[PDB]
Design a protein around this ligand. Structure first.
Ligand code: SF4
Ligand code: SF4
Ligand code: SF4
Ligand code: SF4
Ligand code: SF4
Ligand code: SF4
Ligand code: FES
Ligand SMILES: [Ca+2]
Lengths: 169, 571, 905, 145
């Protein structure tokens, strides 16, 4: 499989990083109170809310305080793209200024959607290659171009025929 | 004579009193559907009229609202004075159980009004926001700075020539804003905030980190001498979106203001749109709306009490609301003229299972609240204010009733058939501390369960949407079968329903106080002006005047005791 | 007059009906069968108000506001409960048979019936029985027919028959089975059949060309533009979606084209959407075609222009004033050549001299409908200036209007007027080389060669005024008909003389000027109209320059070694062999064009210019009216690599890169200021539209409706990140709905009509001062010149009569509305409507040739032998041979040329 | 354990089919204009028999707030919000769902409705007068008065 810019220990390191993930939950807006550690110790940043223009610098600074390796999960349509607030005071997506590894649609997403995002991030971490040391070898991060989730789940989604009618609970 | 009929309220005694005091030619009475006497005052008589209303035999004691309107694009301005901008002042008399709206007309070249901070101190933040969003100066204001936008903001976003949509992002301006946020503590100037005596030299200035916002603190050791809360970090431009969505498609945005509220925030918007539309909704709509608003009020109160001191009760409410509307947090389910669907088959089983399982939890909550001596030592007596302080700062909801002032919207000014439900309004002593507010919220939880029992027990049979032609959208089976209904649905979901030109107003008792929607229609399919008064704004402005001489931990407890969210503050 | 509507006093015109008076006051009354241009009939019964006898009358009576005069002391109630009930009932009765078709109906969101159903307040069906249904007809490539949606309001037949004069649309049947259509399947024959898609208040008649690529009205990006398909300059609203031009709606102009277009301007927009258009600058290097961006194309072109000795510029009457001026500045005034031939230019400048020096006032297109007698000399008006033909038809019906006004019958009561004036009509005298489409209402038609038409004009002028030069050899029967024309023209209060450059004769224009001068000498209120050939023919004539023949001479002699061709294919104004040889001799050919023309194979650089949809500019009417057209959309919004700039932008940056070696993408108002500074006779174009700093209370004018959809998904397949909204530095319009389109805004350029509650083309009533009048703050456009104080002299160059000489064949020009224009005949929907290439012959000439109808003859013109099949034309004269101008292989410059070796293939 | 979602739950959006097996969408664009976010984009095409269908159909799910206004506005019940919430993606470009990612093989939550059985427009298999509550077309040349 393709990647984007002696071997078993790399899988060991990936397994250690994958099973041990410490989040920093950014409050921001109502995606946070749906879904419910200093940034120095946390390695995953969960942006859950509208990226307002007055606190885009706060998000950028608290992202810059984290240490490599670092991953970003964007919950909610606001953090994905701006959502419904295509308005003057709202940044249209947190991926305008920080790199995002997993996106979850929803307004808000369910907590189980965040669990699914955690599983997706865990697979992404497990299938990537990072430098072991900063003195030996290539000092480049190899992200894997994984198969998209909407094309992976296309067969069972298209195969759906009948649903329950909305007149009952 | 329906409730939504356009009236001028010339039979109001305030109009006769103002005429006998200032003369008949001093003001212009406007006919609205706000339910309020709207009078247009000269700018030079404005402080005189405010002082006269403050000293009536049953005086107008509370400034409910103060904001601006851009009247330049308003075409249907018949019977109105010539204005390029206007400032409106909503004043509430509780003894009279009335309210009045004063309006001051302003030309484009002379945008300045005398300030009301000598009459009503909440006009401080109201006038700062009116300056920030419309560009109107208020002469005599102590510190007229921006409150929603950053101080280095170009233009006033609520003006009609300001584009609503998001401009191009720039890392350039982003790194400037980051570098001024890094150097803010080094270059803190304590008169760009309204502070004084900045470094005495024993005084220390800090910044503190229900939403995320900053509050600048001035300390004598550990005692708070002055504080200013920095808000606007959660500003979404919801009122501007009101000017850029159709009447129907603005409903989700009404949900996302005060996000713990859901249908409680949905309610005053559709009530004001139905006042604009001349719609009277049937009783089944009234009971469905009351039931959903009380379910969400119970959810919000449980979250507030759990935060102040759980997950199962709110989960049961969320499953019931998810079964009715299809969504937990932002149902988007109230409609103009009714509700989006009928109740699902099995709603009563879920509500009966929720109501048969709740009273023992309520007894547990009362045990954990009124028998907790650690909480009863930590909470009462701190950040306490009386009735006079709550009236002058626009405090509504649990704080106002905890001061002994028996004012609830659901009883004084009933809406959506709340007079058909038997429920009590808890009022406390004369002291509004953390403890009395928490027990008032517990008693309101009990009363909301009573209202839910009455919603379940005698639920009307009938339509869930009105027979009115302006009901948006029309019933879906007639839309899918009948051509005139298909036509009405077509033009109501595409161009939008046409509300004839009028001004409407609805205030309701939200989960955190009084929430009101003031809607101005220019005869089009969008709102000309959407003014949203939220209680968390007025409650946050009272924070400096309530903890003068307290400690920082006392400030933290006060912040916990106030039911507020930043989306409600900033909208 | 004084009326009282619901107790409110209003001052109105007493000569109007109550429906138009109340619509002019902003009051909303539902209506179907009334049109401002068609008058009142009282069919649909929708416009009911309640009339009272006086102020102290309570019971009233329901009257029909379109059939009730707005007299003094009138008392009506619109919001009476009985009137409201009856209007809802009328909507209900229409709804009983209406199909459940709105999602699959092209009228949806633009439907007057949808608007009036919503306005009356009818949304509940209590009808349980069956609906009547109808079979549909095939009405040709442009109009789609769906008779189920009809509400039997008779607007289509009233327009198509009483107004447009067409004969193949009617109403058939009876009680509730009335059917509106053709007597059989086939193409609608009228040149103004396209206006049925806006006359019909339902989805019965719809734009088939738009139905191919349908999008709803709220999804369009609209701009106010000028139609480019002939010289009349009708105001249009082109609307786009997803980067392609989707529809041409009519844009109301109370001075030019009020409610109506012609079929060419309405349906020949499809050349904009062609996939072979230049979208990027391309440089020829050997046999390779290297694609460049704007900067390096300008650098390479500027280097090649700087190393050359003389650079000539060949403009076009297609291009705007700004583009032609930019080319004139780039190459120099003495090096600038108009791209038209010498004879075409001579006829054009004579038409301009008659217009702006002859001392006779040239009417606007709307004002043509008030003239009492019409003489058309040489110009096939229906095929070259069709809206002038429609206005001529209205002026002809003016006689019935006067007769009905004599009997105190109101002007809106169209059935009474048409009954009183049965077949009486104002005198119309047309001349052509054959039959025209105005012969049904012409008092006389003269089929003759252009020399004999000019001689008839000179003889009419001599009989009106003896100081005009006399014509010898007039036959006694032709002299009797000339005396008939003279008696009709002399007795008219307002005569109108129409001619143009399409007849291919200088002497026809001279004769028309002579007739107009003779009528002006008798004190008559005479007007003269000249039909130019292209959209900016009079602008290119006012600018001036050498002919195309001079430019080809410069290229062939080697005096010019670099040629810049602007929006010109060069084959419609000169022979293709000569053009090809001259362009092959040049070491630099640079073609700035928006259509893939045939001269791009020899071109060394091709600049992808913008068409009228992708550009701004100014064009000059056939009556000398300067009109701005604004850009509809950004071509680079969807395809990021598209470099398709305005022609004047390309040429101004090329001039700047030639002078100071830096690119300069200027602004439109800078180019307009340069035009009005350097050319004082074009100084009126500054006031054609306001500058880019014009605001309505601080905001720009919106190009798209306020309910525009798909903002965050229309480009998501290219990139999920939303691009920046396109910036329009050139005009006062914004490429978004963040702007103003209020009907009460103080402007004259309205991109599209929409009001809350009026989503149809009936929304134009809100944007007008009175309905059927002008726009509320005046029509857009400005006349360049006024009527001169002093006239011309009589032209004394009277031609001799046509002599049919053996071996030669005089080429008589036949024009077709679908085919003669260049860009519109490139549009793919026109090939179905295009006539087959047929060469017209007299029966005597064809019998002499041994050739019957349909067999193919071969003739050689300019060393090129081509073969066409023969159609017999009885109306032609012997010694003439008929050719369709502007088609494939037949340049319009052949009009008046001779033919050799016409023999059967 | 699997999560329980009620039938009204507003989750992943699909385009459904009629009982005959053809796609219900007539490309009327009412969903796109009723979307307050503007994250629906489609284009009308027509079959040889005159049936309106979407040439393409795309939804920006990174923008979509799952409000259900499109389903409420659909007059054919083609577009529906289904009880499914597992839509997390690695790339935001993969959150733009084309017609191949939205068109399921059944009627979804409305098992029987067919808009083209009620419309008067003639398509293949439904001539004039063959729809619901519709009389046969009376020819204008009929002998009956
Ligand atoms: S995506 Fe929706 S739920 Fe999440 S922060 Fe935005 S508005 Fe709130
Ligand atoms: S003509 Fe109008 S009302 Fe009738 S189907 Fe078409 S859009 Fe609907
Ligand atoms: S086809 Fe159209 S214009 Fe003609 S009568 Fe029917 S609805 Fe009226
Ligand atoms: S008359 Fe000429 S300018 Fe007018 S629409 Fe037709 S082609 Fe265009
Ligand atoms: S659910 Fe709402 S936001 Fe999502 S596509 Fe439908 S209308 Fe748009
Ligand atoms: S509203 Fe329904 S039928 Fe219309 S375009 Fe959308 S999915 Fe298709
Ligand atoms: S508009 Fe008057 S009856 Fe038709
Ligand atoms: Ca431009």
């Amino acid at each position: 499989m393709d990647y984007t810019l002696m071997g078993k220990l790399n899988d060991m390191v990936n397994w250690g990083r994958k099973n041990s993930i410490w989040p920093y939950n950014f409050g921001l807006s109502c995606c946070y109170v749906e879904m419910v550690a200093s940034p120095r110790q946390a390695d995953l940043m969960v942006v859950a809310g509208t990226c307002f223009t007055k606190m885009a610098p706060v998000i950028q600074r608290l992202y810059d305080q984290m240490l490599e390796p670092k991953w970003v999960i964007s919950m909610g349509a606001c953090a994905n793209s701006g959502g419904m607030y295509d308005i003057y005071s709202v940044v249209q997506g947190v991926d305008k200024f920080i790199p995002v590894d997993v996106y979850i649609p929803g307004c808000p997403p369910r907590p189980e959607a965040y669990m699914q995002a955690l599983m997706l991030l865990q697979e992404s971490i497990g299938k990537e290659r990072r430098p072991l040391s900063w003195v030996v070898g290539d000092q480049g991060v190899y992200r894997a171009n994984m198969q998209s989730e909407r094309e992976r789940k296309r067969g069972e989604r298209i195969a759906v025929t009948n649903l329950r009618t909305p007149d009952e609970i | 004579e329906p409730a939504w009929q356009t009236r001028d309220h010339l039979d109001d005694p305030v109009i006769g009193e103002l005429r006998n005091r200032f003369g008949p030619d001093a003001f212009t009475v406007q006919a609205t559907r706000t339910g309020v006497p709207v009078v247009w005052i000269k700018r030079e008589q404005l402080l005189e009229v405010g002082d006269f209303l403050k000293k009536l035999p049953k005086p107008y004691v509370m400034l409910f609202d103060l904001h601006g309107m851009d009247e330049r694009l308003r075409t249907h301005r018949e019977g109105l004075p010539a204005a390029d901008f206007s400032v409106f002042y909503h004043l509430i008399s509780i003894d009279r159980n009335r309210d009045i709206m004063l309006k001051v007309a302003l030309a484009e070249n002379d945008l300045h009004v005398p300030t009301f901070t000598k009459l009503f101190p909440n006009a401080n933040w109201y006038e700062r926001e009116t300056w920030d969003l419309f560009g109107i100066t208020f002469d005599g204001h102590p510190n007229l700075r921006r409150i929603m936008m950053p101080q280095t903001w170009k233009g006033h976003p609520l003006r009609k020539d300001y584009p609503a949509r998001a401009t191009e992002f720039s890392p350039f301006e982003l790194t400037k804003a980051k570098q001024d946020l890094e150097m803010e503590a080094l270059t803190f100037k304590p008169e760009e905030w309204g502070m004084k005596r900045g470094t005495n030299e024993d005084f220390m200035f800090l910044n503190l980190g229900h939403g995320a916002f900053r509050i600048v603190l001035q300390l004598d050791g550990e005692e708070i001498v002055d504080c200013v809360p920095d808000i606007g970090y959660h500003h979404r431009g919801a009122e501007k979106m009101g000017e850029r969505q159709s009447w129907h498609s603005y409903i989700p945005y009404t949900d996302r203001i005060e996000y713990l509220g859901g249908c409680v925030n949905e309610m005053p918007y559709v009530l004001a749109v139905e006042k604009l539309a001349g719609i009277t909704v049937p009783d089944r709509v009234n009971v469905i709306r009351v039931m959903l608003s009380e379910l969400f009020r119970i959810n919000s109160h449980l979250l507030y009490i759990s935060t102040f001191i759980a997950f199962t009760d709110r989960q049961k409410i969320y499953d019931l609301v998810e079964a009715i509307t299809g969504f937990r947090m932002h149902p988007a389910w109230f409609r103009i003229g009714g509700v989006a669907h009928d109740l699902p088959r099995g709603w009563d089983r879920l509500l009966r299972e929720f109501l048969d399982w709740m009273p023992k939890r309520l007894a547990s909550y009362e045990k954990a609240a009124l028998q907790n001596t650690i909480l009863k030592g930590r909470s009462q007596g701190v950040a306490a204010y009386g009735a006079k302080e709550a009236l002058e700062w626009g405090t509504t909801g649990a704080g106002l009733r905890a001061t002994g002032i028996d004012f609830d919207v659901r009883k004084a000014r009933p809406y959506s058939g709340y007079e058909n439900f038997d429920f009590e309004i808890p009022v406390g002593g004369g002291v509004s501390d953390c403890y009395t507010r928490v027990m008032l919220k517990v008693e309101e939880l009990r009363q909301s369960l009573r209202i839910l029992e009455q919603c379940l027990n005698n639920m009307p049979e009938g339509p869930f949407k009105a027979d009115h032609p302006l009901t948006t959208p029309p019933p879906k089976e007639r839309t899918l079968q009948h051509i005139e209904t298909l036509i009405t649905h077509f033009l109501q979901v595409s161009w939008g329903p046409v509300m004839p030109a009028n001004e409407s107003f609805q205030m309701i008792e939200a989960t955190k106080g009084i929430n009101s929607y003031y809607l101005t229609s220019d005869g089009s399919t969008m709102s000309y002006r959407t003014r949203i008064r939220t209680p968390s704004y007025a409650h946050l402005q009272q924070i400096p005047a309530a903890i003068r001489g307290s400690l920082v931990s006392d400030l933290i407890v006060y912040l916990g005791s106030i039911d507020f969210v930043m989306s409600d503050v900033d909208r | 007059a004084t009326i009282h509507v619901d107790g409110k006093e209003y001052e109105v015109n007493g000569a109007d009906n109550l429906l138009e008076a109340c619509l002019s006051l902003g009051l909303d009354i539902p209506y179907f069968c009334w049109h401002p241009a068609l008058g009142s009939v009282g069919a649909c019964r929708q416009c009911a108000v309640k009339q009272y006898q006086n102020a102290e009358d309570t019971r009233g009576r329901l009257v029909m506001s379109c059939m009730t005069p707005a007299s003094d002391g009138t008392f009506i109630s619109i919001d009476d409960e009985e009137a409201k009930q009856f209007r809802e009932s009328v909507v209900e009765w229409l709804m009983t048979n209406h199909p459940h078709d709105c999602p699959v109906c092209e009228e949806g969101g633009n439907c007057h019936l949808q608007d009036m159903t919503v306005m009356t307040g009818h949304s509940f069906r209590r009808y349980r029985f069956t609906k009547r249904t109808h079979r549909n007809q095939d009405l040709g490539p442009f109009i789609s027919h769906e008779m189920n949606r009809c509400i039997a309001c008779y607007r289509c037949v009233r327009y198509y028959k009483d107004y447009a004069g067409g004969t193949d649309l009617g109403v058939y049947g009876a009680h509730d089975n009335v059917y509106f259509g053709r007597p059989e399947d086939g193409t609608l024959e009228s040149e103004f059949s396209g206006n049925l898609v806006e006359i019909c208040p339902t989805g019965v008649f719809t734009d088939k060309t738009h139905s191919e690529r349908y999008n709803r009205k709220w999804d369009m990006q609209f701009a106010p533009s000028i139609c480019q398909q002939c010289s009349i300059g009708c105001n249009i609203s082109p609307g786009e979606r997803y980067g392609e031009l989707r529809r041409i709606e009519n844009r109301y102009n109370g001075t030019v084209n009020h409610y109506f277009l012609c079929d060419r301007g309405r349906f020949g927009y499809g050349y904009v959407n062609l996939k072979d258009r230049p979208r990027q600058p391309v440089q020829r290097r050997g046999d390779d075609f290297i694609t460049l961006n704007a900067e390096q194309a300008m650098q390479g072109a500027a280097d090649i222009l700087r190393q050359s000795k003389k650079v000539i510029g060949i403009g076009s009457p297609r291009a705007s004033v700004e583009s032609n001026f930019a080319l004139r500045e780039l190459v120099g005034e003495e090096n600038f050549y108009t791209g038209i031939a010498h004879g075409e230019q001579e006829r054009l400048q004579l038409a301009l001299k008659v217009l702006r020096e002859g001392g006779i006032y040239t009417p606007a297109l709307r004002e043509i409908e008030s003239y009492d007698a019409v003489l058309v000399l040489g110009e096939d008006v229906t095929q070259t200036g069709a809206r002038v033909a429609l206005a001529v038809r209205q002026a002809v019906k003016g006689k019935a209007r006067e007769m009905a006004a004599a009997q105190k019958v109101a002007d809106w009561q169209i059935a009474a007027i048409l009954n009183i004036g049965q077949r009486a009509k104002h005198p119309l005298f047309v001349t052509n080389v054959d039959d025209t489409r105005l012969d049904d209402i012409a008092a006389w038609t003269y089929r003759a060669p252009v020399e004999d038409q000019a001689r008839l004009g000179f003889a009419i002028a001599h009989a009106l005024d003896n100081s005009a030069p006399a014509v010898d050899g007039i036959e006694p029967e032709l002299q009797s008909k000339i005396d008939v024309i003279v008696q009709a023209l002399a007795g008219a209060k307002k005569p109108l003389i129409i001619s143009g450059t399409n007849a291919g004769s200088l002497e026809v224009i001279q004769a028309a000027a002579n007739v107009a001068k003779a009528l002006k000498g008798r004190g008559a209120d005479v007007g003269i109209t000249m039909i130019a050939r292209s959209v900016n023919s009079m602008g290119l004539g006012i600018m001036g320059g050498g002919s195309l023949e001079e430019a080809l001479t410069e290229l062939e002699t080697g005096r010019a070694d670099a040629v810049v061709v602007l929006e010109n294919d060069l084959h419609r104004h000169a022979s293709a062999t000569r053009v090809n040889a001259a362009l092959a001799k040049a070491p630099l050919v640079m073609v700035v064009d928006h259509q893939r023309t045939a001269i791009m194979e020899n071109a060394h650089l091709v600049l992808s210019a913008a068409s009228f949809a992708e550009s701004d500019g100014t064009v000059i009417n056939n009556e000398g009216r300067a009109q701005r057209f604004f850009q509809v959309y950004d071509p680079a919004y969807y395809d990021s690599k598209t470099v398709m700039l305005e022609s004047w932008r390309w040429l101004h940056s090329l001039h700047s890169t030639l002078l100071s070696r830096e690119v300069d993408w200027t602004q439109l108002d800078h180019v307009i200021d340069a035009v009005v500074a350097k050319i004082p006779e074009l100084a009126g174009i500054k006031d054609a539209a306001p500058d880019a700093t014009f605001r309505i209370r601080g905001q720009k004018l919106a190009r798209e409706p306020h309910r525009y959809s798909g903002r965050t998904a229309m480009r998501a397949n290219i990139s999920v990140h939303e691009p920046r909204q396109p910036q329009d530095i050139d005009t006062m319009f914004t490429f978004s709905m963040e702007g103003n389109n209020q009907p009460t805004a103080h402007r004259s350029q309205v991109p599209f009509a929409w009001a809350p509650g009026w989503n149809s083309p009936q929304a134009w009533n809100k944007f007008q001062d009175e309905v059927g009048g002008k726009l509320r703050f005046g029509d857009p456009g400005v006349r360049l010149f006024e009527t001169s104080e002093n006239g011309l002299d009589y032209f004394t160059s009277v031609p001799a009569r046509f002599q049919p000489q053996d071996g030669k064949w005089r080429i008589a020009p036949y024009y077709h509305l679908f085919g003669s224009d260049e860009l519109s005949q490139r549009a793919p929907v026109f090939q179905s409507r295009m006539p087959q290439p047929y060469i017209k012959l007299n029966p005597a000439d064809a019998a002499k040739l041994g050739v019957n109808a349909g067999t193919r003859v071969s003739f050689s013109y300019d060393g090129n032998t081509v073969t066409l099949p023969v159609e017999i034309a009885e109306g032609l004269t012997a010694g003439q041979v008929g050719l369709p101008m502007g088609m494939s292989g037949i340049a319009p410059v052949l009009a008046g040329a001779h033919l050799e070796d016409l023999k059967e293939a | 354990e699997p999560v329980y979602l009620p039938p009204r739950y507003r989750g992943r959006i699909v385009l459904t089919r009629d009982p005959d097996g053809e796609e219900r969408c007539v490309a009327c664009n009412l969903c796109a204009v009723a979307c307050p976010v503007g994250c629906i984009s489609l284009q009308k095409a027509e079959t040889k028999d005159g049936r309106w269908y979407p040439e393409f159909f795309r939804i920006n799910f990174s923008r979509c707030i799952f409000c259900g206004l499109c389903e409420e506005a659909c007059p054919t019940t083609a577009i529906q919000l289904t009880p499914d919430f597992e839509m997390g993606e690695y790339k935001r470009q993969d959150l733009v769902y084309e017609k191949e990612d939205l068109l399921i093989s059944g009627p979804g939550k409305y098992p029987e409705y067919n808009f083209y059985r009620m419309a008067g427009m003639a398509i293949d298999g439904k001539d004039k007068g063959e729809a619901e509550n519709e009389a046969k077309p009376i020819d204008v040349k009929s002998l009956l008065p």
